[PDB]
Design a binder for these strands. Structure first.
Lengths: 91, 93, 77, 92, 89, 104, 98, 79
DNA sequence: ATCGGATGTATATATCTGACACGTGCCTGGAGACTAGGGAGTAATCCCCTTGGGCGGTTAAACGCGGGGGACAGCGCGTACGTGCGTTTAAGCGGTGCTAGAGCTGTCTACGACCAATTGAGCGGCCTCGGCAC
DNA sequence: GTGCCGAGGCCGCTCAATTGGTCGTAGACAGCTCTAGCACCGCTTAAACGCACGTACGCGCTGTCCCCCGCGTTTAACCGCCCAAGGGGATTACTCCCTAGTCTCCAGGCACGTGTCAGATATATACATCCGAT
């Protein structure tokens, strides 16, 4: 418990490819636009641009959520750390 | 025109862009020249770093990952491109 | 329920690329809620940029402008 | 029909690394970077001319747009090179 | 400055409250800041579509983009009411 | 010679707003409803902030608005605190805030 | 002698300074500081007297904002005391210099 | 000179009290003295650039307000 | 426990500024009326591009089961910071000046917008052939 | 080893950017005036500074238990290959409402010159709260 963890931290920082499956993400972005404008359609490059920005946002939030956990002398990230990280960034 | 200045960028197109965007009423003569020089300088400093990062990976063509790494190593460029996300550039290990 | 299509392994992959070693089991209801806030802040502007143009299709350029309005720039489209 | 900076960036790259080439995605990244920087410098120049009461954008306020927009050691070189070109443009 | 007009609005909502010189300076700064945010958003909206005119549709989209939700919802209604009274009456 | 403001039923200067829109060169041309719309929006926002500030001044048993009251009204409300998220009102001050874990 | 327990005179200070609006640094040393700083970029400068006021009032609203979130870092770490670690954490995950 | 030292310990404690702090460690003061200098250097470097563009020899109050608005810190109350 | 000292804030007397608040005065300046040119805008057409109907196939996700290693609680020690008191600086009120700016006006020479006629500079679309990925 | 393909070359071109010539109006500039800024001096007093005690909060050590990780099996989902006959999106059109110019009487807040508070501040008076000792 903890070994392979490291390996994944290594490899995934070398790659460049997308980590969320494409079809469920497309389905999500379509449902959360039905409450702004009914009968809407997306270009295929418009949904690739949303995923690139969302994944970058989540990766950037995870790596200062990890500074907060270390500041409190832990190694496990908890939902309390995400809230501290977003509290100070302003969100 | 922009051969008398030793530049590689188009001074005429830069002037067309400056007068199209209606930044001001009158545009001087040295303004497109100055602006076109300071753009090729920045292009030349990003491309050299990207090519250096290409050489280490035993590659002969630059890819988005190489621009990402070149921007995130250097301090000045990372300070200038502090909020930009390069498409499929990965992250700094 | 589309929100659940973002699965626990995907969240762990994102955290692993962030450098995180151990993850509590309450992370995956918190991430799934901050993601939906971020995403519906951007889609709301990208759809406003469309209407103005009388279009019915969200293009990849509306999304870029909506992202630039929020301080984050996106190169390469 | 669609105009970009592809030729000029390619020529600069051949001037820097005579043998390295560049793919299409990186070429788009570089085109976007140049557009972004142009827009930044031009908008700052316009606004800074508007603070004073002048309808003309000369070169000496491309100076200070650069000194406001570029950080530290990056600007001190860029400014210098800019002056270079202008001199070689006029005393030609 | 907008002082004069600002004072008028005050005498409509609180007919018995006054205001000092520095609070009026604050209000002037706030109005000048909001006007320039809206006028620049309209400029971008017109340039993204290649139109040379800023009509009252660019202002509406600039309000939707700049003001927060419930605030923008009421600003839009105020403005459209004003334009209707202007053209009709 | 009725002014534009009276035709629009406003208190802000529609004509001066139109001049400010022209000079400053935001586009080649400016419609006839743009300054009316913009002036109506500016008046609305002004009345919003001034009403909250007047309430805050009555709450402090005063009859004159000062910067402190503008600070209180802005940072208490939700949408206004979002809009004026990163602005510094001068000669105002932060609102009272003592964390729960410091009282005993 | 009648003493107060540690941390009771500190809580009436927090209440005192969170009701006032005054300017909490001495005026003259701040001006000497800003003149010393500006003495590099250009020499023999003059300062309009309302500019140093704007600088002082822009600089204290920054420190007051930084302290009220280096105090969220201390409570996250199970403390009531602030050390430089909290300032560095706060400034990092703000990007102030990262 | 040591002008920086003219930001005294009592004033820093006053600022922390307005920030909500209850206890201060003894090393905070030299950290605060250093993180104030960076902020002032950035703002003053922009203000003097605005001044020298106008061909003036007096940093005025918009040079400061413009320098501040440029870095995300809008200030009301000075023009 | 309260209970009663002992230092705090919280209500009520005043004066006392020094301003917010309305008399005036010219400025500009918005409003009104015509004229000109052309940007709206709403037709009419071809399409590329946007969706749903359906197989496969190969992953990847979901479920369950040890079992240890990390979080969290408790306990002890001792060290650094808070409270209060008696000096020691130095900021901040007022008075003198006093040169070094910032602001406005008047005058001419150079410089940039507008417009005609060129022509070689960019594009979009033909084919290879090596280059890094299989 | 094995393909098998995207980057680089070629291209016919046509519409962009160059040269030349005029004109009218910003730049520069020189002169003067009056603010704006800085600096020296003496006095007071409020704040900073040093110091001593004491305590309570930070930090380390130990134990317990629970929940997260690694691995293996089975289910179901995303990515794949092909297709519909929808729509939608950038095209071009005479046509007419609308924009900016150039100008005449009436407007329509900015200055400066005065007073009447009203919220400040100081003295006074209770009414409320930390502290210690039983």
């Amino acid at each position: 418990p903890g070994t392979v963890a490291l390996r994944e931290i290594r490899k995934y920082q070398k790659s460049t490819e997308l980590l969320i499956r494409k079809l469920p993400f497309q389905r999500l972005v379509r449902e959360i636009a039905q409450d702004f404008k009914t009968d809407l359609r997306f270009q295929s490059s418009a949904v690739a641009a949303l995923q690139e920005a969302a994944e970058a946002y989540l990766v950037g939030l995870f790596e200062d959520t990890n500074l907060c956990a270390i500041h409190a002398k832990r190694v496990t990230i908890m939902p309390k750390d995400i809230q501290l990280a977003r509290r100070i960034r302003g969100e | 025109r922009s051969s008398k200045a030793g530049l590689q960028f188009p001074v005429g197109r830069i002037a067309r862009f400056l007068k199209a965007g209606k930044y001001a009423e009158r545009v001087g003569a040295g303004a497109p020249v100055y602006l076109a020089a300071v753009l090729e300088y920045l292009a030349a400093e990003v491309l050299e770093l990207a090519g250096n990062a290409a050489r280490d990976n035993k590659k002969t063509r630059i890819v988005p990952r190489h621009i990402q790494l070149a921007v995130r190593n250097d301090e000045e460029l990372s300070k200038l491109l502090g909020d930009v996300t390069i498409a499929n550039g990965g992250v700094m290990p | 329920d589309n929100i659940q299509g973002i699965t626990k392994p995907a969240i762990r992959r994102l955290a692993r690329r962030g450098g995180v070693k151990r993850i509590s089991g309450l992370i995956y209801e918190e991430t799934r809620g901050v993601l939906k806030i971020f995403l519906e802040n951007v889609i709301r502007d990208a759809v406003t940029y469309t209407e103005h143009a009388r279009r019915k299709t969200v293009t990849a350029m509306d999304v870029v402008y909506a992202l630039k309005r929020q301080g984050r720039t996106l190169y390469g489209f | 029909s669609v105009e970009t900076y592809k030729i000029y960036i390619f020529k600069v790259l051949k001037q820097v690394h005579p043998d390295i080439g560049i793919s299409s995605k990186a070429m788009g990244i570089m085109n976007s970077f140049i557009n972004d920087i142009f827009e930044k410098l031009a908008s700052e120049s316009s606004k800074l001319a508007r603070y004073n009461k002048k309808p003309t954008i000369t070169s000496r306020e491309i100076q200070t747009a650069v000194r406001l927009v570029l950080p530290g050691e990056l600007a001190k070189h860029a400014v210098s090179e800019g002056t270079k070109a202008v001199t070689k443009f006029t005393s030609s």
